[PDB]
Amino acid sequence: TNQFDYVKIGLASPERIRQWGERTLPNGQVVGEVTKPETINYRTLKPEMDGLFCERIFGPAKDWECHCGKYKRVRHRGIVCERCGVEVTESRVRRHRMGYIKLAAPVAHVWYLKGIPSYISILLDMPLRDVEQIVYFNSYVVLSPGNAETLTYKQLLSEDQWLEIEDQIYSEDSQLQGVEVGIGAEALLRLLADINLEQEAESLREEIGSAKGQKRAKLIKRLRVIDNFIATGSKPEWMVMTVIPVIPPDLRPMVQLDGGRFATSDLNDLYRRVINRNNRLARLQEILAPEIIVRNEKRMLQEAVDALIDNGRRGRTVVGANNRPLKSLSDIIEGKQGRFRQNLLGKRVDYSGRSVIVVGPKLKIHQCGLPREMAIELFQPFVINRLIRSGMVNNIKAAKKLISRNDPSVWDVLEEVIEGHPVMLNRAPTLHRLGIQAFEPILVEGRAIQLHPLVCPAFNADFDGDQMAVHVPLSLESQAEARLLMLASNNILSPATGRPIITPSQDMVLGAYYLTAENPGATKGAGKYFASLDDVIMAFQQEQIDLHAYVYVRFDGDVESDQPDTEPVKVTTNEDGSRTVLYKYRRVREDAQGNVISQYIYTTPGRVIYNKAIQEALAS
Amino acid sequence: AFLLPDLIEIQRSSFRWFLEEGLIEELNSFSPITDYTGKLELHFLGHNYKLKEPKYSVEEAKRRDSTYAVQMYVPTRLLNKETGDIKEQEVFIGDLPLMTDRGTFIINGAERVIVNQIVRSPGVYYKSEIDKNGRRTYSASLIPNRGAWLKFETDRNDLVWVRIDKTRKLSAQVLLKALGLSDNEIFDALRHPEYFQKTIEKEGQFSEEEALMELYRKLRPGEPPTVLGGQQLLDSRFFDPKRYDLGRVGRYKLNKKLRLSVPDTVRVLTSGDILAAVDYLINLEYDIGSIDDIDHLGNRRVRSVGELLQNQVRVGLNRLERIIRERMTVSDAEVLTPASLVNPKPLVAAIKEFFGSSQLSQFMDQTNPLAELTHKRRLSALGPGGLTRERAGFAVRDIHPSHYGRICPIETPEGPNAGLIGSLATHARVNQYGFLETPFRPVENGRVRFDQPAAYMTADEEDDLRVAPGDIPVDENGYIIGPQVPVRYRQEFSTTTPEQVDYVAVSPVQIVSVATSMIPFLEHDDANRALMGSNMQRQAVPLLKPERPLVGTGLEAQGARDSGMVIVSRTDGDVVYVDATEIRVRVSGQLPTASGKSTDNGQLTSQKGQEIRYTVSKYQRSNQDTCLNQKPLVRIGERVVAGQVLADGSSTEGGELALGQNIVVAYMPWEGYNYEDAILISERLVQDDIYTSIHIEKYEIEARQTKLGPEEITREIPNVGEDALRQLDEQGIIRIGAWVEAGDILVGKVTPKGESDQPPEEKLLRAIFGEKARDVRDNSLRVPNGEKGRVVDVRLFTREQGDELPPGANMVVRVYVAQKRKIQVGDKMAGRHGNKGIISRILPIEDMPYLPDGSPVDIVLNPLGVPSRMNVGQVFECLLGWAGHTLGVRFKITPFDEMYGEESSRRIVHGKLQEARDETGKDWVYNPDDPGKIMVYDGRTGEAFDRPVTIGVAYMLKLVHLVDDKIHARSTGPYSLVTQQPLGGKAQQGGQRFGEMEVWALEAFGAAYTLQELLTVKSDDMQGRNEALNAIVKGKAIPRPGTPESFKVLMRELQSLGLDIAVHKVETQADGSSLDV
Amino acid sequence: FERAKTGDIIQGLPRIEELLEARKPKEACILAKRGGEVKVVYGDGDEAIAIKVIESNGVVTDYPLGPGQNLAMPDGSVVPAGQPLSDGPSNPHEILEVFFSLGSEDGVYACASHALQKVQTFLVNEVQMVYQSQGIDIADKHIEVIVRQMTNKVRIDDGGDTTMLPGELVELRQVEQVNEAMAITGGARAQYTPVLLGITKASLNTDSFISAASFQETTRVLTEAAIEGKSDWLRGLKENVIIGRLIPAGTGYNTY
C-alpha cells in the first residue's frame, strides 16, 4: 500500500529493454542476455546456461545452487559461483528477472503498427500498404537523401523502380542525392528518427487555424500525438525497437509432467523461434548471403517478433504442436480471460465450500446448515488453535492427526469455535450485493446446506438442485462487518426499492390465508363471544368455535377492518352509554357507559391467531 | 399394430454398408497407381478387404484395455508397364474395430460410439434477396461433395459473375469458362443469357486468352499468366476426381433439381450442367422457379460412420499414396516388391485417430439403457463439416417444419447446444442417400386400408399431399370420420375432408423420440417440461432391481430389447442349465442349446451345447461408475425363441425397461421440508433397499523410473500401523474384498527422495534424537475421503502384466471399489415430468400421514401443480397408478388418447378407479366426490383436515448427479503454477472463484475489508497466505497484507512489451520520487 | 397489403439497451424550432403527400419526408420540441441540439441546462416505461444516477480559449472552469453544447487507464496511454482492488 502512489505507463527504449536483464556480475561482465532458444537439456534437466532458462541470468531454479555446483544451501547466498556465474539467490529471484535479446534487425512494434490509428502511420502521415510495405520488405522508400535528386520523398521504389533508381546510375549526370532506400524497417527507423517535431504543434499548427473546412480531424489528430510525444519524452523512433525483453522464465514455465512428458509453454516457443531467426540472420549477413535471402530473412524475423507480441494479428497465425493458434504475449492478458479479467478481478480463493442446497426448516433464518464434513475444513485451523488452547492437542501435527481421528473435540470444540462466526453464502456469481450475506454456521448432518425460505427469493433459489458456495471470513475485523452489515437478518428490503424482500412467499402465504380466510357457513363457534386471553384460542383447541367462524372478541384497541366501517350502523339506543352501537364489525359502549367500554370485534377465530402471533412477536 | 424396426439399426446399417462395400468402391477406385512414368503400374484387385479376424473377445479387449479391431488385406495385381510383370502381393493395411454388440466400438478397452451428424447436401442452391429498397437480386451456389464451390447472382445490372468462394471472383462472363461459339449459353439456354444476351461488356475475350488472365489478372494474381496456367488451374479445381466429388447425391440432386440428364455416375461435373444452373438463375431473374430453403430437412443430409469413416479413410490413402508414389516409383525396377513399398501407417493413423478422437468418437455413456439408445440414435449438427456454435446462430436451430416426423422436437440439451443436437424420431430412418424416409400410410378415398405395411417413402417432408396426422378419429373400418381432418400440406396444416387425402401417419406418437414418446400421459403437458422429462429419464441411475413401472407407455419392451444391455434368446431352445453366471441352456447341449439344435447357424456352433454359452456379467463399471449385471432370470427347462430375452441388464426388468420405482405419494404442503422444490420421504423408502444404487470405482496408480530410480510398491512403508501395513498385501496392495475407509491405503508405494537440501534445524532435531532419518517419500495410495465399500478388484499392469503403461512405467495398478448407497438427503430425484426435486428430511416412518388403511404414504410432493411446468399429465397418472396399485395390475397406454370428443384419458382413469373400488370394496379406493381424494391422517398425531388430498403412486427416479458428486472444501491446498492461486478445479481441493459480478456484491456492501483480504490473503500475497495462516494458529489476529501477485505479474508482461512502469512513491517533504520491485 | 407491428410481446432490453447507449438510429424529422400554425397533416399536404413541418413565427416552409411505418399528426400549439416535432423517438442527441436550438438564449449554461436536464428527464422516463411495460420496478433514483453519469460532457468548439481543441469533447467543469478563467483573464468562450457520451463511451478510456484497460482496450488504450505516460495513481476503487489495497472508503474513509 505505502510502496507507491501512481503508475507510469510508457515505452521501453532499447537501453531500458537491455536494462531489464543486465545482471552484471563481480567478475565484472554483463549478462541477462540469452544466446540460445532451446530449453532444459535432454540428458539431465538443467537449464543449459544461456537458453530460455539460463540461470545465470534469471536465477538458480534450485534455490542456492550455482548451476555449476559447489554450493547447495542458503549458507552460500550473497556469495555466487566462480565457475558458473550463477547468481545464488534462493529461486523466487526468478519469475522476475528479465532478459532480452539484442535484435539483429528492428521490428515496427505490431502495436504501433497495425493499430486502429496505426500511430506509426499517424506520425508518418503515410497510410498502410505503403509504410506497411516498408517493413515487410516490400518496397522501398526514397530516403531524404535518396530523393535529393529526381526521386520524390516517400516515393515507394518497391524494387523494380528501386532498381530503375539504381538504373540511370551515377555513372551518368546527377544521381548525387544519397541512398537509404527503405527496403526494411531499418530505414523507417530513420524516418522517424529523422524528424524534429518542436515545429509540429506550432509550425504545423499554422495549418490548424487555416483549412477551416479542411479535413480537420486529420490534423488535430496528428497533433495531439505529436504534441504528446514532445509533451512526454516520446521520440517515435522508440517505437520501432531493437532489443527485446523476455519473460522471466517461469512464467513461461515449463514442466515435467509425471508421465514423463513435458509441459512446454508457447511463450518460450514464440520466443525461441525468434531467436533462431535472429541468429541465423546474423550468420546470413555474416556469410554476406545475397540479399534477397537476407532480405527475406529479415522479413521473417520481423514477424516472428511480431507474432510473439500478438499472434494472429497481422500475418498468419502461428499454429504449433498445440494444433491451434498459439498464445501470444497479448491475449494472455486480454480477453474474457486475459489476466485482467479473470485472474485479476476474479480470483479463485480457498476457505470455501459448495454444495447442493436444501430447505433448512427447524433451523431459523440468519442460520445455516452446514454439513459436518465441509464445516471442518472450512474451519480448520481455527479449530486447531482451540485445541492447543484447551491443551488437549500439543503440537499441531498432533492436532492434525487428531483432527482426522475426529476426537470428541473435533465435533465438540469445533462448534465452539464456530458460532459467532459468521459465514458468507452465495448462489453462483451474484452482481447484487444482497446476492451474498453473512450467516451463522450451525452444524448439520447430511450434506446439504440447509437454507431458509424467507431468504430464498433474495438468492433466488430453487431447490431443484442449485448450489451455493461458502466462504468464511478471517480477520476478525472482517468478521465484524459480516455481522454488522451483511447479516442476513438485517436486510429486509430491496436495496433497489424500499420494498421488503423478505416475504413469506408461498405456501406460507396460503397458510396464512387459509388461516385467515373466511369459510362461509362457518357455524361451529360462530357469533360466539370472547374477551382477551387469548381465550378464544383455548376455545379453539377445544373447538368451542371453528378456525373459520365469525365470533365477537373483547379487544380494546383498534381494528382495522378492511372494508372500513366507521360510521355506525344500528346503534342500540336503550339506556346508559346505550346508544350502544354497532358496526359492520365492532360493537361498543360510549355515551353514559363511557367512551368504548364495549369493544367486541366481528372477526374469525383464525385471524385472531394471526394477529396474535404478530403481536407477541413484536412487542410484548 | 405396426412393427418397429429395430431401432438402432441406423448404424448397424451404415457400417455394414461401408463394409459391405462402402470402401471397396472407393478403394479400388484408389487401386490404380504406377511409376512416375506410366511405366511401372501399382494397381490392386481392390475388391476384398480379406480381413483376418479379431483377436480378442470383446471381453478381452476390455480386459486387455485394447481396441477390438480386425485387420485387413488387399490382394493386389500384376504390376508395371515396363515388362508387364506382377510382383504381385496382397496386403493388409490396417486394423478395423469391427463394431460391437451395441452397434458401437470399443477401443483402448474403453467404449465409444460414433455419433452421426447432419449436413447439407451437395447439389446447388439459390438464394435471392433484396437491397435496402426492393432490389431483389438472386444468387446461386454450388457444392460438390468435396471440392471448392461456384457462386453466382445478379448485381443491379442483371449481370453476373462467377464468384468461387463467398465473393472470391466476379466476372461478366459467368458462363464463358471452357466453351466456344458462345451460342452454347447464348441460345442453347433458349432463355436470357445475361437477360437475352450479353453483358454490356459482353466482350468474348477468350481466344488465346481463354482460360488465361481470367484465372490470373483477376485471379490468383502476380504471375506472368499463361493460357496454360489458367487452364491447368481450373481443370484441377473441377476435374480431377482427385479433388472434386460431386457426390452421388451430388448428381442425384442436380439432375433432379435440374433434370439434367447426366446419370453417368458422372461423379464430377460437366459444362452443360454449369450453364444449366446459370440459366436457372436467370430464368428466375424472370422469375421462373424457386429459390431454395436449406432449412428444409429434405435438402440436408446426415451421415454416419459409413462414410464419415470412409472418406476420412480416403485421405488416409492419399497421404499413403505419396509415400508410395515415390518410394515405389522413383527407385529401381527390381527391389520394388508389392510389399515394401506400402505402408499402413498413415491409414492406421487416420483411423486410429478418427476414432481416437474426433468430436465424434464420443464416449458412450451407459447410464442406462435408454441413455444409450438415445445416444446412438442421436444426431448432430455440429462437427467438422458442420458449424460451430458461434458461427451459426438461431434460426438454424429451429423446428423447420420439415422435421416433423423426423426429429423429435422435444429433444435437446441446452446449454447453447439447443437445437444443435437432436435425436431421431422414433420411426425415422434414412435412405442411402441419407435422407430420412418417413413411414406413413396410403389413405385411399381418404381412408387407410391399414393392411399396407406402412409406406416407407416420404424421405423428405414434401410428399406434397394430403397427409394425415396419425391421430384421427377413425371410423372402424377405414373411414375417417370428421370432414374437418387437418393435414399438413406444403408445410401447412389445412382443414381437410376425408376423401381427398392420401396419407396418414402411422401413429400420433412418431415425431417424438426416446424418453419423449414414453411419457405416461404426454398428451397433456407442456412441451418443454416434457423436455426436461425426457432428460431426466436419461439420467436415472440404475438400481439393484429397478421395477417396471406401473403405468407405462407400452412402448418400451422394445427399447430395452435393443439396448443390448440384456441378453436375448439368440436363437432358440428350451433352457437347461442356468447358474447365475450363465445359462447353460447354451454350451450345455440340451433342448435350449438344442432347439439351439432346431436350426443351426451358418458357421456358428450349430447344435451342441453351444457358446450360446452366453456368459453374463456382474458388476462391471459404467461410463458413470454405475454397476450392471444380469441374473439368469429365466427358469430351467423351458422354452425360448429367438429374440426373447434372457437376463437383464442393469435396470430393466421383466425384460423391459424399468427405470425407477413407484411409490405412493401424496400432495400436500408438508411444512418447510417440501415447502418448495423439496421432497419428503418415509424411512421405509430406502429401508426396503429401494433407491440405493451401486457405484464403483477406478483408482489406478503407477510406478515409474525416476532418474532417481524406481519408487515402489512395497508392503513396506515407513510410519505405518493399522490402515497402513495392515490391510496391505506383500506389495502393499489390498486383498479383494476388503472394506476400506477414507484414508486407508490402497496401495503403498514410496519414492527415492534422498535429501541434498535440508535446514540445519532438521539436522538438529536429528541430533537430539539423532535419528538418522529415512529418505523416501511414500506415496502410498489412499482412499480419499468419503468412500467406503468393499473392494472389488485389482488390475496390476507391468512388463508381465500386459505392460500397458506410459514409456518407462513399471506397474500400473487399477483398483476397483464399489459402494452401495442408499438414498439420502440431498439428491436430485424426479419424476418422469420435469419434477426436479431434492430430498430434505426423512421421516421416520411413524410420523408420515400414512393412509386411511394406515399404509404409510411416502413422498410428499407439493400439491399445486401444472403451473409453469404445465405437467398436469402427472397427476393423471398418479391417479392411475393408484388404481392399478389398488387393483395391483400394470397398464400400458399412449399419448394423444384422441378418437374421443372428451379428454378420454379422463374417463378412463376414473373409470378404472371407479371400478377399482368394488373389486375390493375398500371404498376409499375411489371417491367420485373429490376424485381420488382421500382422507389422511397424520402420523404425528392422528387427524386429517378440511381438504382431502389426492394420492397416487407414481414413478420416480433418482438422478446421477449425486450430492457427493458436488461437495467441496478447502481450507487451503495446492496453488497454481504460475499464478498461485489456489488450484481450483473440481476434483481436488479446488477453490470458489470470485469474479467481478461477485465483487460487485462486496464493494456494493458496506465495510469491505473482507473484500480486500479475500482478494489476497486467501489468494495471493504468497507470504501473506502463509503467515496469516500462522497468525491465526498463533491465537491472535493476522498481519496487514501486501500486494497480491498477479499484479506483480502484470507488471512483468507489460514490461515485456516496451514499457517503463514507474510504480512509484512520492515521499519526503522533498517529495521523493522513487520506483520499486 | 401493409401490415402491423402487432403481436403479443414488444420491447425489452434491447429497447433499453439501445437508448442506453443512446444509439442514433431513431428516424425523427423533429425541427430545431417551435412554431404553431395548422400543419394539416404531412405539414401542408394531405392530398397525396408532403411530410413537413412548421415555421410559424417564421415564413420559411421546410418539408422533410417520412415513411409508411411511422405517421405523425400533431397539429397546432406545436412543440418547441416540447415534443419531438415529427413523432418517432427524436434521439436525445437530436433533441439535445434541438433543445439547444430552442435552448440558446439564456446563459449558454441555462440554455444548456434547461435543455440538458430537459432531455435527461426525458430519458429517465423513457426507461421507466419500459419497466412498466413489465411492471418491473427500478428506483428512478438509480437511473438518475447513471444517466447523469451519462451526460455531463461537453464537446468543445472554437476552443482557442480553453485550449481544448474546437471539437474536443471533454468534461463539463475544468473546461467551463478554464472558460471562467479567460472569461475573467481575457479570451474567447469555447462552445459547450452539452452532449451525451452514451454508455460504453462513458467509462473505458477515462482518467485511470487501468480500469479502462481492464474494462476493455486492455491492449488498445494500453498503446495510448503508453504514449502518454498517462499516469494513473489508481486513486479511487476498481484498482485498489485490482491492486490490493483496499478502497477509498474503509479505513481510507475512517483514518482518512
How would DSSP label each residue in A41-57?
-SSS----SSSTT-TTT
CB contact under 8 A, C213 and A5: no
CB contact under 8 A, A232 and C229: yes
Distance CA A1, CA C252 (A): 11
The region that residue B842 occupies, defined by phi over 0 for left and psi between -120 and 50 for alpha, beta otherwise, is beta
CA end-to-end distance (rounded Å), chain C: 70
Q: Which helix (H) or strand (E) holds A228?
A: helix A217-231
Contact B397/B419 with Cβ under 8 angstroms? yes
Backbone angles phi, psi at B228, to 5 degrees: -55, -55
| B196 Cβ contact list (under 8 Å, min separation 6) | none
Distance CA A591, CA B803 (A): 107
Residue in the structure block whose three cell numbers are 397525396: C48
Residues of A in contact with B1015 (CB under 8 A): 347, 349
Distance CA C66, CA C50 (A): 9
Q: Residue A359 is nearest to which of B840, B1064, B1077, comparing CB atoms?
A: B840
Query: How many angstroms away from the CA of A177 is the closest CA of chain C?
Result: 35
Distance CA B554, CA C156 (A): 78
Distance CA B623, CA B63 (A): 15
State how beta strands B949-956 and B992-993 pair: unpaired
**A68 in a labelled binding site:** yes
DSSP state of A500: B
Q: What is the dihedral angle through the alpha carbons of B452, B457, B460, B461, rounded to the nearest 10 degrees?
A: -20
How far CA B578 is from CA of B587, B618, B620, in Å, comes to 11, 15, 20
Query: How many angstroms away from the CA of B1007 is the closest CA of chain C?
Result: 6
b/e map A573-599, b = 16+ CB within 10 Å: eeeebbbbbbbebbbbbbbebeeeebb
CB contact under 8 A, B1008 and C222: no
Whether A111 and chain C come into contact, CB under 8 Å, resolves to: yes
Q: What percent of the residues of chain C are helix, what percent strand, and what percent coil, each to the nearest 5?
A: 35, 5, 60
Residues of C in contact with A111 (CB under 8 A): 219, 222-223
Distance CA A319, CA B620 (A): 42
Identify the closest residue of chain B to A243 by CA–CA distance. B1058
Distance CA A156, CA C150 (A): 47
Nearest to B519, CA basis, from B547, B549, B546, B542? B549
Angle between helices B369-376 and B527-538 (to 10 degrees): 110
Nearest to B402, CA basis, from B456, B460, B457, B441? B460
Contact B42/B75 with Cβ under 8 angstroms? no
Q: What is the largest CA-CA distance in chain A?
A: 142
CB contact under 8 A, A345 and C242: yes
Interrupted backbone of chain A, residues before each interruption (C–N > 2.5 Å): none
Query: How many angstroms away from the CA of C222 is the closest CA of chain A?
Result: 8
C-alpha B302: how far from its chain's center?
15
| A485 Cβ contact list (under 8 Å, min separation 6) | A438, B1005, B1006, B1007
DSSP state of B541: P
Distance CA B809, CA B712 (A): 11
Residue B1038 is placed in which grid cell? 493476522
Which stretches of B688-787 are DSSP H helices?
Answer: 760-769
Whether A224 and chain C come into contact, CB under 8 Å, resolves to: yes
Nearest to A168, CA basis, from A195, A188, A190, A149? A149
Identify the closest residue of chain B to C234 by CA–CA distance. B1063
Residues of C in contact with A224 (CB under 8 A): 165
Q: Residue C244 is nearest to which of B1041, B1054, B1058, comparing CB atoms?
A: B1041
Residue in the structure block whose three cell numbers are 482496450: C217
Count the neighbouring beta carbons within 10 Å of the beta carbon of residue B900: 12
Q: Residue B1008 is nearest to which of C222, C226, C250, comparing CB atoms?
A: C250
Residues of B in contact with C250 (CB under 8 A): 1007-1009, 1012
In one letter, which amino acid is C202? A
Contact B1076/A33 with Cβ under 8 angstroms? no
Residue in the structure block whose three cell numbers are 483402448: B108
Task: Write down how long chain C is.
Answer: 256
Q: What percent of the residues of chain B are helix, what percent strand, and what percent coil, each to the nearest 5?
A: 20, 15, 60
**A464 in a labelled binding site:** yes
Distance CA B274, CA B450 (A): 46
Count the neighbouring beta carbons within 10 Å of the beta carbon of residue B930: 12
Backbone angles phi, psi at B544, to 5 degrees: -60, -50
Residues of C in contact with A119 (CB under 8 A): 223, 227
Count the neighbouring beta carbons within 10 Å of the beta carbon of residue B293: 14
Residues of A in contact with C159 (CB under 8 A): none
CA end-to-end distance (rounded Å), chain A: 51
Count the neighbouring beta carbons within 10 Å of the beta carbon of residue B1000: 16
| A329 Cβ contact list (under 8 Å, min separation 6) | A247, A267, A270, A308, A309, A310, B1053, B1056, B1057
Residue B885 is placed in which grid cell? 396399485
**A54 in a labelled binding site:** no
How far CA A250 is from CA of A53, A288, A547, B1052, in Å, comes to 8, 37, 75, 12
Residues of C in contact with A228 (CB under 8 A): 227-228
Q: Which helix (H) or strand (E) holds B918?
A: helix B905-918
Tell me the three-class secondary structure of A383-418, residue by residue: HHHHHHHHCCCCCHHHHHHHHHHCCHHHHCCHHHHC
DSSP state of B548: P
Query: How many angstroms away from the CA of B1035 is the closest CA of chain A?
Result: 7
Distance CA B58, CA B70 (A): 12
| A514 Cβ contact list (under 8 Å, min separation 6) | none
**A412 in a labelled binding site:** no
Q: What is the largest CA-CA distance in chain C?
A: 76
SS3 of residue B701 by DSSP: strand
Whether A333 and chain C come into contact, CB under 8 Å, resolves to: yes
Q: Which helix (H) or strand (E) holds B929?
A: none
CB contact under 8 A, B840 and A332: no
Distance CA B201, CA B199 (A): 5
Residue A22 is placed in which grid cell? 543486465
| B828 Cβ contact list (under 8 Å, min separation 6) | A464, A465, B836, B837, B838, B958, B959, B961, B962
Identify the closest residue of chain C to A339 by CA–CA distance. C214
Q: Residue C243 is nearest to which of B1007, B1047, B1059, comparing CB atoms?
A: B1047
In one letter, which amino acid is B825? V
Backbone angles phi, psi at B584, to 5 degrees: -75, 85
Contact A174/A165 with Cβ under 8 angstroms? no
CB contact under 8 A, C214 and A8: no
Contacts 24+ apart (CB under 8 A), B763-769: none
**A84 in a labelled binding site:** yes
Whether A230 and chain C come into contact, CB under 8 Å, resolves to: no
Distance CA B707, CA B730 (A): 25
Residue B569 is placed in which grid cell? 434368446
Distance CA C35, CA C56 (A): 4
Identify the closest residue of chain C to A341 by CA–CA distance. C214
Resolution of this entry in Å? 3.6
Distance CA A348, CA B993 (A): 3
Method: cryo-EM
CB contact under 8 A, B1007 and A508: no
Backbone angles phi, psi at B891, to 5 degrees: -155, 125
Residue A8 is placed in which grid cell? 507510469
b/e map A226-260, b = 16+ CB within 10 Å: bbbbbeeebebbbbbbbbbbbbbbbbbbbeeeeee
In one letter, which amino acid is A516? T
Distance CA A449, CA A467 (A): 9
- Angle at CA of residue A132, ends A127 and A134, nearest 5°: 115
Residue C230 is placed in which grid cell? 498517462
Count CA atoms within 13 Å of residue B68 on its CB side: 20
Distance CA B755, CA B764 (A): 15
Whether A179 and chain C come into contact, CB under 8 Å, resolves to: no
Nearest to B72, CA basis, from B54, B94, B48? B94
In order, the DSSP letters of B951-1003 are EEEEEE-EEEEEGGGG---BSS----SSS-S----TTSS--EE--HHHHTTTT
| B694 Cβ contact list (under 8 Å, min separation 6) | B544, B619, B626, B627, B818, B819, B820, B821
How far CA A202 is from CA of A219, A227, A236, in Å, comes to 12, 9, 18
| B337 Cβ contact list (under 8 Å, min separation 6) | B87, B89
Q: Residue A341 is nearest to which of C139, C214, C241, comparing CB atoms?
A: C214
Distance CA B738, CA A403 (A): 25
Residue in the structure block whose three cell numbers are 514490461: B1055
Count the neighbouring beta carbons within 10 Å of the beta carbon of residue C45: 14
Identify the closest residue of chain A to B810 by CA–CA distance. A259
Nearest to A309, CA basis, from B1051, B1054, C217? B1054
CA end-to-end distance (rounded Å), chain B: 82
Nearest to B250, CA basis, from B349, B121, B360, B150? B121
Contact B274/B177 with Cβ under 8 angstroms? yes
B662 has which bridge partners? B955
* Chains in contact with C, where contact requires at least 3 CB pairs less than 8 Å apart: A, B
Burial class (CB in 10 A: 0-12, 13-18, 19+), B635: exposed
Count the neighbouring beta carbons within 10 Å of the beta carbon of residue B338: 21
Identify the closest residue of chain A to C215 by CA–CA distance. A341
Distance CA B395, CA B385 (A): 19
Residue B689 is placed in which grid cell? 433397499
Residues from C contacting B (CB-CB < 8 Å) are 222, 226, 237, 240-247, 249-250
Residue B151 is placed in which grid cell? 457462386
Contact B858/B665 with Cβ under 8 angstroms? yes
Query: How many angstroms away from the CA of C78 is the closest CA of chain A?
Result: 36
Contacts 24+ apart (CB under 8 A), B802-809: B802/B64, B802/B65, B804/B64, B804/B65, B805/B702, B806/A259, B806/A260, B806/A261, B806/B702, B806/B704, B807/A260, B808/A260, B808/B704, B808/B705, B809/A259, B809/B702, B809/B703, B809/B704, B809/B705
Query: How many angstroms away from the CA of A600 is the closest CA of chain C?
Result: 41
Angle between helices B248-258 and B272-282 (to 10 degrees): 50
Count the neighbouring beta carbons within 10 Å of the beta carbon of residue B622: 22
In one letter, which amino acid is A41? N
Check the CA dihedral B851-B854-B855-B861 and report its sign.
positive
Distance CA A246, CA A308 (A): 11
Contact C35/C56 with Cβ under 8 angstroms? yes
Residues of A in contact with C223 (CB under 8 A): 111-112, 115, 119
Contact A140/A182 with Cβ under 8 angstroms? yes
DSSP state of C110: H
In order, the DSSP letters of A320-369 are -TTSSB---TTTTTTSSSSHHHHHTSS-EESSEEEE--EE--SS-SSEE-
Tell me the three-class secondary structure of B646-692, residue by residue: EECCCCECCCCECCCEEEEEEECCCCCCCCCCEECEECHHHHCCCCE
Contact A11/C226 with Cβ under 8 angstroms? yes
Whether A568 and chain C come into contact, CB under 8 Å, resolves to: no
Outline where DSSP puts E strands in B266-416.
300-303, 361-363, 378-380, 407-408
Residue A551 is placed in which grid cell? 365470533
Distance CA B424, CA B5 (A): 14
Residue A330 is placed in which grid cell? 497479448
CB contact under 8 A, B1012 and C244: yes
**A368 in a labelled binding site:** no
In order, the DSSP letters of B502-538 are -EE-S-SSSSS-TTTTT-TTGGGS-HHHHHHHHHHHH
Distance CA B737, CA A189 (A): 77
Q: Which helix (H) or strand (E) holds B116?
A: strand B116-120
Whether A344 and chain C come into contact, CB under 8 Å, resolves to: yes
CB contact under 8 A, C219 and A310: yes
In one letter, which amino acid is B411? E
Contact C198/C22 with Cβ under 8 angstroms? yes
Backbone angles phi, psi at B34, to 5 degrees: 180, 160
Residue B594 is placed in which grid cell? 438344442
State how beta strands A450-451 and A358-359 pair: parallel
